[PDB]
Amino acid sequence: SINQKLALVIKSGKYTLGYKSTVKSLRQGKSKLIIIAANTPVLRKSELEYYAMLSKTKVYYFQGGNNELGTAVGKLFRVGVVSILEAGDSDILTTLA
RNA sequence: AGCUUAUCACCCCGGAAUUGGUUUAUCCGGAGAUGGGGUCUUAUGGCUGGAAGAGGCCAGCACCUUUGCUGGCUCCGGUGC
Numbered sequence: 001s002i003n004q005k006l007a008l009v010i011k012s013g014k015y016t017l018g019y020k021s022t023v024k025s026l027r028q029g030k031s032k033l034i035i036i037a038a039n040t041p042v043l044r045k046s047e048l049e050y051y052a053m054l055s056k057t058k059v060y061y062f063q064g065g066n067n068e069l070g071t072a073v074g075k076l077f078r079v080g081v082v083s084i085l086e087a088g089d090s091d092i093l094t095t096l097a
Numbered sequence: 098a099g100c101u102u103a104u105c106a107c108c109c110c111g112g113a114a115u116u117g118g119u120u121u122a123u124c125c126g127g128a129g130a131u132g133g134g135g136u137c138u139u140a141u142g143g144c145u146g147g148a149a150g151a152g153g154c155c156a157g158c159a160c161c162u163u164u165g166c167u168g169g170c171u172c173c174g175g176u177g178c
Contacts, residue, residue, distance in 0.1 A: 018127030
């Protein structure tokens with residue numbers, strides 16, 4: 001499912017974690033996608049799409065909290081929002097998601 | 098009273114697994130650490146003014162007395178379940 005395609009871009013294309021990075025990354029247009037965990041509060045969430053819509057960047061919502069999102073990416077620690085800098089062999093940018 | 102001074106807390110850069118900081122007592126970190134640089138409360142503490150002409154310890158003077166003058170030092174530290 002959506003976990004497998006994340007598990008392939010982890011080493012085929014550069015990416016980033018955290019929140020301050022995602023806000024910084026999309027400023028110059030280097031972000032093609034972001035992922036928002038359901039655990040984050042709406043006010044914290046409401047930033048991302050407003051910055052994303054200014055960059056014409058699609059926003060993908062994640063079914064689950066930040067605890068599980070970090071495991072899906074491949075890091076033992078947890079991540080609230082994930083931004084994809086550029087996809088590799090994966091097709092996360094161009095898919096039903 | 099002037100200058101100055103701490104934990105805690107917060108801010109800018111930065112980005113983390115070969116996970117790391119860390120209290121006597123294991124909490125914290127992508128809701129962003131460790132690190133580098135700063136801000137803040139001023140309990141407390143330090144120098145200075147108050148204030149050494151104050152207080153204290155000592156030597157001479159002679160006053161049936163009422164009393165005083167001349168004077169010196171009033172300094173530098175250390176440790177602690």
